Amino acid sequence: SFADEHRRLVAELNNKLAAAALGGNERARKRHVSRGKLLPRERVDRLLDPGSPFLELAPLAAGGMYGDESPGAGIITGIGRVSGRQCVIVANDATVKGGTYYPMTVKKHLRAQEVALQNMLPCIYLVDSGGAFLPRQDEVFPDREHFGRIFYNQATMSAKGIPQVAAVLGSCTAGGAYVPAMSDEAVIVREQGTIFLGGPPLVKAATGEIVSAEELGGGDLHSRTSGVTDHLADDDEDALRIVRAIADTFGPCEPAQWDVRRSVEPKYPQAELYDVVPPDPRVPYDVHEVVVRIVDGSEFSEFKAKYGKTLVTAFARVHGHPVGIVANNGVLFSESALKGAHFIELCDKRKIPLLFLQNIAGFMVGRDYEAGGIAKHGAKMVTAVACARVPKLTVVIGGSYGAGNYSMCGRAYSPRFLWMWPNARISVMGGEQAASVLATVRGEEAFKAPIRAQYEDQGNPYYSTARLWDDGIIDPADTRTVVGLALSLCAHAPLDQVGYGVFRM
Amino acid sequence: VLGSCTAGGAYVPAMSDEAVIVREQGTIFLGGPPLVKAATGEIVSAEELGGGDLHSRTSGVTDHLADDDEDALRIVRAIADTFGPCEPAQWDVRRSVEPKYPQAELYDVVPPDPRVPYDVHEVVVRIVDGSEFSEFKAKYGKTLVTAFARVHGHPVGIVANNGVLFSESALKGAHF
Amino acid sequence: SFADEHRRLVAELNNKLAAAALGGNERARKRHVSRGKLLPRERVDRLLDPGSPFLELAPLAAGGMYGDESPGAGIITGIGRVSGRQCVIVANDATVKGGTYYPMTVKKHLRAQEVALQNMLPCIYLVDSGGAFLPRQDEVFPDREHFGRIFYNQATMSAKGIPQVAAVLGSCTAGGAYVPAMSDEAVIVREQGTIFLGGPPLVKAATGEIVSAEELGGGDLHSRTSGVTDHLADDDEDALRIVRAIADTFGPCEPAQWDVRRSVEPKYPQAELYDVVPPDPRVPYDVHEVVVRIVDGSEFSEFKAKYGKTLVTAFARVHGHPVGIVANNGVLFSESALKGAHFIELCDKRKIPLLFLQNIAGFMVGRDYEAGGIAKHGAKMVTAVACARVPKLTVVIGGSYGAGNYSMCGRAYSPRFLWMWPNARISVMGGEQAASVLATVRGEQLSAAGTPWSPDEEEAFKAPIRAQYEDQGNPYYSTARLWDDGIIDPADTRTVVGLALSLCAHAPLDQVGYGVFRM
């Protein structure tokens, strides 16, 4: 059954999540904790207000990459409440190769800061990293989206009055020394945390001077003499207590950007989503079955219900927040695109956040469809998506292919968050299509085989999350709560003015 | 659109942000049947030319198809429920206090004939909350009455004629 | 010869302009100057910088109205240079019923102030008015667009830093006393100009006092005692010299809102427009023939030349000013409207003023056209016209009928100026169209009632309808009521537009922003 396959895919997801959450192997975990340190997960947990939810970003980053040397890319990122304030938390997982930055580690750290910027969320960095993965230093160090961008972000966010707070719980070396040094306020654990631009081996090599990490950049040195840190903590727990105290001094938030109501529960259990969405993307279904189950009171007000019926556009609420749902329901026609662009203008003017539910089946193809201007009608929707000032959220519940991705607010359209279901697939086109194209050029089956395989491989949701094309794979049954949680985060970043690029009429 | 909508009037729904139309009742066209006939000789009914089904399924001129008037109004109410945040009140509103007098006493106090003199204080004292007011320049330019008060908890500055206007009355009004 | 007819219409227009420009009859004009006053038009002429052009607004206001007792509505309004500054000038024509305000006089006064506001132009009021036309006081006094709005305008314009300057050259009474009293700076001519809220008859009626106009509110009284005026002038010429000196103290202008180039002449004489445009709006022609002649160097870059061909959209220049020309070239289709909306978006982003050349029968009609969403495509264009932040100018060169008027920036869409050619027509629908449509409905009713009509009777029914639309739709009827700012010689189109664009160039533009586009 549909549900049996969904439950199987979810169990597989949860096993992967549990495994990745452990971090390094049992030996490394033993070594981390031997000296009095808390495990990285424990650190995040003790920082959060009791009972606070934690929206974790990119937990399966680097999955199937680097020979699986770095689960979660050796770093933990998410949003949770600290002294009553929502905060982006970034914790180096020192059990995973000493918390070294692989390329995906950098990408993950940066993604957390991007979320912080867009939602005006304070940043808390729990530092414990041995440095860069040197065999791949070219994918870690030099470019705009590499390690240097971390500090660009800290400084520019600080200038905007978004607090930047660091707690140095372990090693912090070379460029990594700028994490605490460029924080507004920094804590360090005595006889445990160290900070230096030039570490002991480099000191030895450059000068012959032989020096311990502690003598070179220990907690006592920086808190008493240099002034690189602002708080000296007894241990990890005391450091986290101090961070919570810092957070309690954060200034006033911006008001909610829209009116939030009492949440009203849906008339169906969320597990029934397993019954209505076929895991196989070629089985057709009515996406109304999804919409009716995730919204407050199972009530929605459908815009253009009888026009452009392969796209569903509906006003609803999720956990009391107003939302404009844009959901695929077949192949996109010109009418569908016009409908979507109009609907987005309405949400934009009424200040209704947008939620895109992607299940792409391409655009309609043929002489009459191109002659009717399908390219310019699709373009009008892309313009609307790209220029909308309201927060956008994207959940890929089925396929995500080609130009349809762009029209439905894919990753390049900067939705505040983008998630995928475990049945989702994403690629420039389908596997059979790509092989048909590269073969006919070659001719003018054993050639097609590795290509059909490539697209199964690359289009898989775990391949996607590994690279941070999305912020995580989610249980379909958790869609409603994840969206509700995200919308409450997005509610306090000031909205830009309405303004669009030229619409090609 | 609950009935006919024609010529330039078709822009009412077409230039609306969101438009409802009643099936087999509402019609919209820039050019109605007589003009279609006059110009081209085509014989076409209003329904065929611009009915609710046509615009809600084909043209996209409308966004909601209603069963009847009551359904169309239900739909408008639902649209209104999606409207965004209001601006905050521009001044502080208090709890309303009732006047000391019945409003029907205004009938006894104001001469119907505008030529007949009377004291406009008699009007002010009856319409304002608690029958209270703070008169500005009460002893100066007395043919104009200027007073601070409240009506239904809202602050108001009442400017009320009480005779022929003099220079002093006007200076007083400008200041107030 | 289309051109014989155009030349005849222009000769008629120029005769009407010359007559209206005289103001009152020769008796009235003689009385006015018998005691040393300059004539109203002489006053305007002496105020202007030597050689300055004068863009006159609504010179044929009230034509064929009020039994023609108020030529030009008894008021002169226009824009010209005073001490180097472009100013809106409003002068009461005291030779026309003592400068009495008829309803159109008020409307014309208000129109001038609207132009002043929209283009940030100083206002100069040359006051000489005996008051309101009392038999039509209900159309002069009480409503939002009546006499009171003159002073709302003075005050709100003064608050924005738009100078309000008045010169009292004759009578100024009742509410009209607020013209100088609510001016920032006021001149008055000694032993000639008078100002009072209550004139001698009312003083007598109310109190029994017998007092002369001079004693009650003369120049010496207000300039020495009351302080209602700020300058005492010896005569009209002196008062105008003084206004010129006041204008020389005006502060800095805003910078031009777009880049102005060196003007390049067209390749063709403007009089060739007479040969190219059929006087009859029903007769088809290529509107490119107009565009090629009015623009600099006879050059233009046409946008979407091969799409929606019944609407012409082209970028060009007129007197060095960039313009986006939107010109009708047949019946409007969905594609024409989509094209117009797009074109307008571009001009808006690029800060290119729009020029609408109207000759618009209407939209294509029929089931397939309504089913293709012609109403919503038209709507997009109207949204773009209404919301555009660039200045807009409209010239009706042919028909202006129905919803097409709206889509092509009619009077309700606040173009900075709107003019009409002598051959133009404007009405809710075309005359022949109206007769034909109303006959179609009446013919069907007569048939259904069992009394079908003959061809002769149908024709007898159409004749008064055609007469209604000819009478209510011709340029003289339009211009009399200020639906437009004037009827122009088609050969002056380029000059007038070039002048107007120069005026529009110094008012700050709003941000780009549109209402919802119904996709």
GROMACS .gro file of C-alpha atoms in nm, chain A residues 82-350:
model
  269
   82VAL     CA    1   1.726   3.066   2.448
   83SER     CA    2   1.609   3.283   2.740
   84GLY     CA    3   1.281   3.329   2.550
   85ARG     CA    4   1.445   3.442   2.222
   86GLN     CA    5   1.456   3.238   1.900
   87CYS     CA    6   1.822   3.189   1.810
   88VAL     CA    7   2.022   3.023   1.535
   89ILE     CA    8   2.263   2.783   1.702
   90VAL     CA    9   2.577   2.652   1.532
   91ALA     CA   10   2.778   2.386   1.718
   92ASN     CA   11   3.098   2.229   1.589
   93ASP     CA   12   3.075   1.851   1.638
   94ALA     CA   13   3.423   1.779   1.776
   95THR     CA   14   3.349   1.403   1.786
   96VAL     CA   15   3.351   1.411   1.403
   97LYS     CA   16   3.718   1.439   1.297
   98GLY     CA   17   3.780   1.700   1.570
   99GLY     CA   18   3.509   1.914   1.409
  100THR     CA   19   3.718   1.984   1.098
  101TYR     CA   20   3.554   2.186   0.823
  102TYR     CA   21   3.487   1.981   0.512
  103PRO     CA   22   3.339   2.176   0.219
  104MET     CA   23   2.982   2.086   0.323
  105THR     CA   24   3.066   2.193   0.680
  106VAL     CA   25   3.140   2.546   0.553
  107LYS     CA   26   2.824   2.541   0.340
  108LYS     CA   27   2.618   2.435   0.642
  109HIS     CA   28   2.767   2.699   0.873
  110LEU     CA   29   2.694   2.962   0.606
  111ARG     CA   30   2.336   2.841   0.552
  112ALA     CA   31   2.266   2.887   0.923
  113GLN     CA   32   2.389   3.249   0.903
  114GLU     CA   33   2.172   3.309   0.593
  115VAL     CA   34   1.866   3.195   0.788
  116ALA     CA   35   1.976   3.418   1.076
  117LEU     CA   36   2.004   3.722   0.845
  118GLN     CA   37   1.673   3.672   0.664
  119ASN     CA   38   1.479   3.624   0.988
  120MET     CA   39   1.676   3.867   1.210
  121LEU     CA   40   1.770   3.588   1.454
  122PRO     CA   41   2.056   3.614   1.707
  123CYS     CA   42   2.351   3.384   1.634
  124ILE     CA   43   2.515   3.158   1.891
  125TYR     CA   44   2.836   2.980   1.789
  126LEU     CA   45   2.957   2.689   2.004
  127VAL     CA   46   3.316   2.660   1.883
  128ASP     CA   47   3.518   2.336   1.890
  129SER     CA   48   3.700   2.278   1.560
  130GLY     CA   49   4.047   2.154   1.461
  131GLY     CA   50   4.040   2.347   1.131
  132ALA     CA   51   3.997   2.287   0.757
  133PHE     CA   52   4.010   1.954   0.573
  134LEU     CA   53   4.336   2.027   0.389
  135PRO     CA   54   4.313   1.771   0.106
  136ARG     CA   55   4.009   1.973  -0.010
  137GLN     CA   56   4.130   2.319   0.103
  138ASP     CA   57   4.042   2.458  -0.243
  139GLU     CA   58   3.671   2.385  -0.174
  140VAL     CA   59   3.693   2.529   0.181
  141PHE     CA   60   3.902   2.848   0.172
  142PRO     CA   61   3.924   3.102  -0.116
  143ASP     CA   62   3.587   3.181  -0.281
  144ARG     CA   63   3.281   3.394  -0.191
  145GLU     CA   64   3.086   3.102  -0.041
  146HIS     CA   65   3.387   2.958   0.141
  147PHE     CA   66   3.525   2.994   0.495
  148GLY     CA   67   3.600   3.369   0.478
  149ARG     CA   68   3.229   3.441   0.422
  150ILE     CA   69   3.161   3.328   0.781
  151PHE     CA   70   3.322   3.646   0.916
  152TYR     CA   71   3.184   3.872   0.648
  153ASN     CA   72   2.846   3.749   0.773
  154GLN     CA   73   2.927   3.797   1.142
  155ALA     CA   74   3.038   4.157   1.086
  156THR     CA   75   2.752   4.259   0.856
  157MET     CA   76   2.490   4.093   1.081
  158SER     CA   77   2.642   4.266   1.386
  159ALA     CA   78   2.618   4.599   1.202
  160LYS     CA   79   2.244   4.529   1.156
  161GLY     CA   80   2.213   4.475   1.534
  162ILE     CA   81   2.178   4.095   1.510
  163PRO     CA   82   2.370   3.964   1.813
  164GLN     CA   83   2.677   3.750   1.744
  165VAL     CA   84   2.774   3.536   2.044
  166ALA     CA   85   3.047   3.273   2.066
  167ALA     CA   86   3.134   3.010   2.327
  168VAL     CA   87   3.478   2.855   2.281
  169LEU     CA   88   3.448   2.504   2.426
  170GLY     CA   89   3.747   2.347   2.248
  171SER     CA   90   3.999   2.428   1.978
  172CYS     CA   91   3.975   2.737   1.765
  173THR     CA   92   4.269   2.794   1.535
  174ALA     CA   93   4.389   2.993   1.233
  175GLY     CA   94   4.098   3.170   1.055
  176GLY     CA   95   3.866   2.992   1.299
  177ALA     CA   96   4.003   3.229   1.566
  178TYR     CA   97   3.786   3.499   1.408
  179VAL     CA   98   3.467   3.322   1.520
  180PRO     CA   99   3.509   3.444   1.881
  181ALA     CA  100   3.731   3.745   1.802
  182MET     CA  101   3.461   3.884   1.570
  183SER     CA  102   3.174   3.805   1.806
  184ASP     CA  103   3.004   4.086   1.997
  185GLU     CA  104   3.044   3.880   2.314
  186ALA     CA  105   3.255   3.569   2.372
  187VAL     CA  106   3.288   3.302   2.642
  188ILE     CA  107   3.569   3.050   2.691
  189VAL     CA  108   3.607   2.751   2.924
  190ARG     CA  109   3.918   2.766   3.146
  191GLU     CA  110   4.186   2.501   3.083
  192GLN     CA  111   3.988   2.362   2.788
  193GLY     CA  112   3.913   2.625   2.524
  194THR     CA  113   4.198   2.765   2.317
  195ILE     CA  114   4.218   3.044   2.057
  196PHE     CA  115   4.511   3.133   1.830
  197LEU     CA  116   4.568   3.265   1.478
  198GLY     CA  117   4.895   3.070   1.477
  199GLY     CA  118   4.886   2.735   1.658
  200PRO     CA  119   5.181   2.565   1.835
  201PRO     CA  120   5.314   2.363   1.537
  202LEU     CA  121   5.324   2.683   1.328
  203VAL     CA  122   5.496   2.869   1.615
  204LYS     CA  123   5.758   2.592   1.636
  205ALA     CA  124   5.812   2.580   1.257
  206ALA     CA  125   5.833   2.960   1.216
  207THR     CA  126   6.036   3.055   1.527
  208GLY     CA  127   6.162   2.741   1.709
  209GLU     CA  128   5.969   2.859   2.018
  210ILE     CA  129   5.807   2.550   2.175
  211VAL     CA  130   5.473   2.620   2.345
  212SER     CA  131   5.156   2.441   2.463
  213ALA     CA  132   4.807   2.526   2.336
  214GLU     CA  133   4.714   2.640   2.688
  215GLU     CA  134   5.016   2.872   2.723
  216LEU     CA  135   4.958   3.008   2.372
  217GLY     CA  136   4.583   3.082   2.380
  218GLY     CA  137   4.409   2.939   2.687
  219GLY     CA  138   4.096   3.068   2.861
  220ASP     CA  139   4.292   3.246   3.134
  221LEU     CA  140   4.523   3.414   2.884
  222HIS     CA  141   4.245   3.560   2.667
  223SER     CA  142   4.008   3.651   2.953
  224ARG     CA  143   4.272   3.817   3.175
  225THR     CA  144   4.542   3.950   2.941
  226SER     CA  145   4.448   3.976   2.570
  227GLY     CA  146   4.078   4.057   2.605
  228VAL     CA  147   3.989   3.834   2.310
  229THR     CA  148   3.721   3.675   2.531
  230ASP     CA  149   3.474   3.836   2.772
  231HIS     CA  150   3.377   3.549   3.002
  232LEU     CA  151   3.575   3.272   3.171
  233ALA     CA  152   3.360   2.964   3.237
  234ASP     CA  153   3.435   2.681   3.485
  235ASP     CA  154   3.314   2.416   3.241
  236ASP     CA  155   3.077   2.353   2.946
  237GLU     CA  156   2.763   2.377   3.163
  238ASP     CA  157   2.874   2.710   3.316
  239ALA     CA  158   2.960   2.843   2.968
  240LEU     CA  159   2.610   2.759   2.845
  241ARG     CA  160   2.460   2.921   3.156
  242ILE     CA  161   2.660   3.235   3.070
  243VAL     CA  162   2.539   3.230   2.707
  244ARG     CA  163   2.178   3.211   2.832
  245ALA     CA  164   2.252   3.513   3.055
  246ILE     CA  165   2.391   3.706   2.756
  247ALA     CA  166   2.080   3.621   2.552
  248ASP     CA  167   1.863   3.760   2.832
  249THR     CA  168   2.015   4.105   2.757
  250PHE     CA  169   1.908   4.106   2.390
  251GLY     CA  170   1.696   4.408   2.294
  252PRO     CA  171   1.336   4.436   2.169
  253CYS     CA  172   1.212   4.227   1.876
  254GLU     CA  173   1.030   4.370   1.576
  255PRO     CA  174   0.652   4.320   1.597
  256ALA     CA  175   0.472   4.037   1.417
  257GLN     CA  176   0.438   4.129   1.048
  258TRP     CA  177   0.090   3.976   1.022
  259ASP     CA  178  -0.200   3.893   1.255
  260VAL     CA  179  -0.176   3.549   1.417
  261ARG     CA  180  -0.486   3.370   1.547
  262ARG     CA  181  -0.568   3.080   1.775
  263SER     CA  182  -0.456   2.758   1.607
  264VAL     CA  183  -0.747   2.530   1.517
  265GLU     CA  184  -0.660   2.165   1.460
  266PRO     CA  185  -0.734   1.986   1.130
  267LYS     CA  186  -1.027   1.742   1.092
  268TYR     CA  187  -0.789   1.457   0.996
  269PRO     CA  188  -0.476   1.290   1.135
  270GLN     CA  189  -0.154   1.385   0.952
  271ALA     CA  190  -0.070   1.015   0.907
  272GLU     CA  191  -0.349   1.003   0.644
  273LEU     CA  192  -0.113   1.191   0.410
  274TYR     CA  193   0.051   0.849   0.377
  275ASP     CA  194  -0.278   0.724   0.226
  276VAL     CA  195  -0.339   0.994  -0.038
  277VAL     CA  196   0.003   1.073  -0.192
  278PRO     CA  197   0.145   0.792  -0.405
  279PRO     CA  198   0.520   0.751  -0.344
  280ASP     CA  199   0.548   0.668  -0.716
  281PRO     CA  200   0.532   1.009  -0.891
  282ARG     CA  201   0.357   0.869  -1.202
  283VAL     CA  202   0.035   0.779  -1.019
  284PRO     CA  203  -0.195   1.080  -1.046
  285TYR     CA  204  -0.380   1.215  -0.745
  286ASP     CA  205  -0.578   1.518  -0.632
  287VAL     CA  206  -0.355   1.754  -0.428
  288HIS     CA  207  -0.670   1.889  -0.257
  289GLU     CA  208  -0.638   1.574  -0.042
  290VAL     CA  209  -0.307   1.709   0.094
  291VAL     CA  210  -0.420   2.072   0.139
  292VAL     CA  211  -0.738   1.981   0.329
  293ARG     CA  212  -0.539   1.779   0.586
  294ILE     CA  213  -0.254   2.021   0.674
  295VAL     CA  214  -0.451   2.346   0.720
  296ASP     CA  215  -0.627   2.476   1.033
  297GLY     CA  216  -0.983   2.341   1.071
  298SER     CA  217  -0.945   2.167   0.733
  299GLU     CA  218  -1.078   2.495   0.591
  300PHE     CA  219  -0.946   2.683   0.290
  301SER     CA  220  -1.068   2.942   0.043
  302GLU     CA  221  -0.967   2.843  -0.308
  303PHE     CA  222  -0.867   3.109  -0.559
  304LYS     CA  223  -0.961   3.038  -0.923
  305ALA     CA  224  -1.085   2.687  -0.837
  306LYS     CA  225  -1.233   2.627  -1.184
  307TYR     CA  226  -0.955   2.784  -1.392
  308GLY     CA  227  -0.605   2.647  -1.457
  309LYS     CA  228  -0.690   2.339  -1.252
  310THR     CA  229  -0.345   2.178  -1.269
  311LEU     CA  230  -0.229   2.442  -1.017
  312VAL     CA  231  -0.405   2.478  -0.682
  313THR     CA  232  -0.394   2.819  -0.512
  314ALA     CA  233  -0.569   2.856  -0.176
  315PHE     CA  234  -0.580   3.086   0.128
  316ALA     CA  235  -0.571   2.906   0.463
  317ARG     CA  236  -0.413   2.913   0.809
  318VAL     CA  237  -0.145   2.693   0.966
  319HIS     CA  238  -0.108   2.714   1.345
  320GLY     CA  239  -0.295   3.044   1.334
  321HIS     CA  240  -0.067   3.197   1.069
  322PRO     CA  241  -0.220   3.305   0.739
  323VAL     CA  242  -0.076   3.119   0.441
  324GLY     CA  243  -0.115   3.116   0.063
  325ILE     CA  244  -0.073   2.761  -0.064
  326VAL     CA  245   0.053   2.710  -0.418
  327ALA     CA  246   0.046   2.339  -0.509
  328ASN     CA  247   0.105   2.146  -0.832
  329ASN     CA  248  -0.179   1.924  -0.951
  330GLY     CA  249  -0.061   1.809  -1.296
  331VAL     CA  250   0.119   1.956  -1.597
  332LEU     CA  251   0.156   2.336  -1.601
  333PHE     CA  252  -0.041   2.524  -1.868
  334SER     CA  253  -0.029   2.896  -1.947
  335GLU     CA  254  -0.353   2.938  -1.748
  336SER     CA  255  -0.192   2.776  -1.444
  337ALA     CA  256   0.102   3.018  -1.456
  338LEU     CA  257  -0.122   3.326  -1.492
  339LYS     CA  258  -0.332   3.209  -1.199
  340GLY     CA  259  -0.022   3.157  -0.985
  341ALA     CA  260   0.124   3.499  -1.065
  342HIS     CA  261  -0.206   3.669  -0.979
  343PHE     CA  262  -0.242   3.472  -0.656
  344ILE     CA  263   0.111   3.571  -0.551
  345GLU     CA  264   0.030   3.941  -0.611
  346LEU     CA  265  -0.264   3.899  -0.371
  347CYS     CA  266  -0.061   3.733  -0.094
  348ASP     CA  267   0.209   3.998  -0.141
  349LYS     CA  268  -0.035   4.289  -0.095
  350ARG     CA  269  -0.229   4.123   0.189
   0.00000   0.00000   0.00000
